[PDB]
Ligand binder design. Structure first.
Ligand code: PLP
Ligand code: PLP
Ligand code: 3IB
Lengths: 388, 394
């Protein structure tokens, strides 16, 4: 029977990971000056604290722990958190929350269509294809200016009927790195409430753009305006606990009645999939967020990560400028997040991986955290050498 | 939109524990609990487990993304634990999952991918989650007799007849050991026979192995699984570490795909990793690493097996005690089955009325299907429970 199985398409971003003088600018993971993904101080402290306090590992909360649920809602929504109308579900990472979000939405409406950005995180369309959900794409990346094509984005979103779901990256847009301004978000909220489309926010990099609170500004704006909204959050990157698999889905409802419905359908979704969600990561997050001392060191470390990356983008931008006599590459200092689209065509892209030895996603997506004073110049010369 | 959601039913556990707490009675007892509890009424962390976390706390340098299908050390270690020397790597595909329930879910998704017209056969009765997951997936479900309400043993003759109707490509779900909820198990000779019916029909066996080490022993409890694995070309094993390792909340388990050849192993393995990725990407690392650490570290492994054995011996003694107490009170060996049963659960075979009489009159709580948890018993509770069973006319 199993011999009837057909080969499935692999994840290209992870493919590189398997392949990899070598300069890894692929997989979205923050790397320090020495090409290492460290365990954040607070997280390590939380783990030690946990080792001493836990007395049992019996089954716990089907929808996650109350503490985790509370800490997360406040992290994301701040004072906009109206628990009375919000349902929370702890999931297996942010990816798990996306699937759980699509399942919930489909339960609510069989004839659901999902709009995604052009381009977008490949795993989005994958999950959607797998589910057999109709996917449409709104314009987003302004190819020439390397920025956002907002006029085109608005045009497309306006065509979305109600019951349709629109997927927005809350901040640090993967892969482009190009993002919407708060003003643009208000504009988008206007279209959304006028079309009745349900927004699904993918919040995977809160803290890597402009700051914890500022990276959630757009999400908080949609939440303050649109009566119903779904937010899929990931703690893999901002807490640096990628392998623990921890995140959650937040369902914002118009009232408590619908809230009790969503909460019941969210938990049932976990039960029919894998029972309880993993505890260790959610516990690390809960402990960090509710312990003043630990949240303080965590915020500080993330801020350092954030600032350093911005500092690097600035370098690459400067290197290229003084290494070409032009400013076509100014977009690097303008982008926010971990990634940026170099714009490089597939031919050059491939060449650099072979002879030069640098690994970047086939669409020229570069994880800037993989660069430094040592590799930046070589990279600049590399793109010149590989031309366009 | 979310208002069109048909209200989903709660896990029932809540209504069970809710009523138990409402009871003002001093000496009320709870045998409905689904987890292991020691003398103190606690669910402890195993010594070997707590030691593994300490080691991990000192050696883990990073938490970057790891294996999409699990870490080699884990998959390998699990396969050897379940299949022993018979671990035929070349033809084995493995998948780290979110608990055994994850393993079950993925196994079902895998089978349905290879055979759309898949039909599943489950025992009568079986772990309610089984049915729920299949009903959710929209999979046809057929029952096969199993628990004999009269003898509290296995209606093997009935099981045989019902399984003979399986077609080529259907899935037959079997409990590897310690049947939940009944406690009634198959003898290796009965396993041998079931294997013949499977070869004959060509039905794919999905073995649920969640209590290895809680019946007769690690090796013994896997004998059934190993028989099936040696005689059937394609076998699917859904294992759990939640109970025998005491890491219920860490969500650790794995699916083992046993195939006819290597090319198939390649197809299965790929389809397995694909399933993870479309569900939650990478599987939860923490509990899996605790398991691999214990199993690969002689010092820990020894201590772990030692603790599991003590637990197994302790539960068995409680069984013998209950049976003995029941023999003195009834003047017969009518309830001897309590001593033949294996695992931490046993279905007494009491009707709902009787289950309700016991609660109202004796303050003893249990699942409506009269499933009790052996670990909940002790020198003080046993007498009471025995008296109640007898007094209610069971
Ligand atoms: C990282 C990431 C996620 C979530 O990853 P998990 O490790 O599953 O938490 C979701 N969306 C995007 C765009 C991401 O980059
Ligand atoms: C415990 C158990 C499982 C696995 O559960 P997880 O908690 O997800 O590890 C599967 N089947 C049965 C019958 C069980 O008792
Ligand atoms: O690099 C990125 O795009 C995100 C980080 C890596 C990553 C996390 N989850 C995944 C699922 C599929 C493919 C890649 C991933």
């Amino acid at each position: 029977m199993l011999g009837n199985l057909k080969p499935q398409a692999p994840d290209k971003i992870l493919a590189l990971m398997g392949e990899f003088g070598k300069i890894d600018l692929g997989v979205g993971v923050y790397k320090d000056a020495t090409g290492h993904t460290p365990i954040m101080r607070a997280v390590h402290a939380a783990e030690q604290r946990m080792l001493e306090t836990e007395t049992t590992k019996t089954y716990a909360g089907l929808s996650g722990e109350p503490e985790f649920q509370k800490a997360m809602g406040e992290l994301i929504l701040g004072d906009g958190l109206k628990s009375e109308t919000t349902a929370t579900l702890a999931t297996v990472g942010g990816t798990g929350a996306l699937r759980q979000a699509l399942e919930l939405a489909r339960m609510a409406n069989p004839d659901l269509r999902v709009f995604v950005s052009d381009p977008t995180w490949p795993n989005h369309v994958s999950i959607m294809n797998f589910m057999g959900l109709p996917v449409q794409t709104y314009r987003y990346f302004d190819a020439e200016t390397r920025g956002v094509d907002f006029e085109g984005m608005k045009a497309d979103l306006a065509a979305a009927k109600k019951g349709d779901m629109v997927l927005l990256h809350g901040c640090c847009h993967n892969p482009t790195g190009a993002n919407l301004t708060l003003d643009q978000w208000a504009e988008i909220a206007s279209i959304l409430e006028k079309t009745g489309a349900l927004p699904l926010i993918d919040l995977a990099y809160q803290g890597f753009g402009d700051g914890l609170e500022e990276d959630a500004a757009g999400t908080r704006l949609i939440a303050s305006r649109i009566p119903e909204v779904l937010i899929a959050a990931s703690c893999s990157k901002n807490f640096g606990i990628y392998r623990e698999r921890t995140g959650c889905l937040l369902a914002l409802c118009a009232d408590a009645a619908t809230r009790e419905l969503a909460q019941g359908a969210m938990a049932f979704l976990n039960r029919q999939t894998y029972s309880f969600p993993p505890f260790h990561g959610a516990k690390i997050v809960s402990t960090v967020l509710t312990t003043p001392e630990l949240r303080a060191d965590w915020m500080a470390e993330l801020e350092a990560v954030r600032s350093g990356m911005l500092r690097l983008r600035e370098q690459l931008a400067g290197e290229l400028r003084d290494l070409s006599g032009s400013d076509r590459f100014g977009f690097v200092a303008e982008h926010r997040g971990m990634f940026s689209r170099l714009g490089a065509t597939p031919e050059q892209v491939k060449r650099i991986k072979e002879e030069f030895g640098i690994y970047m996603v086939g669409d020229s997506r570069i994880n800037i955290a993989g660069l430094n004073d040592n590799t930046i110049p070589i990279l600049a010369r590399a793109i010149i050498e590989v031309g366009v």
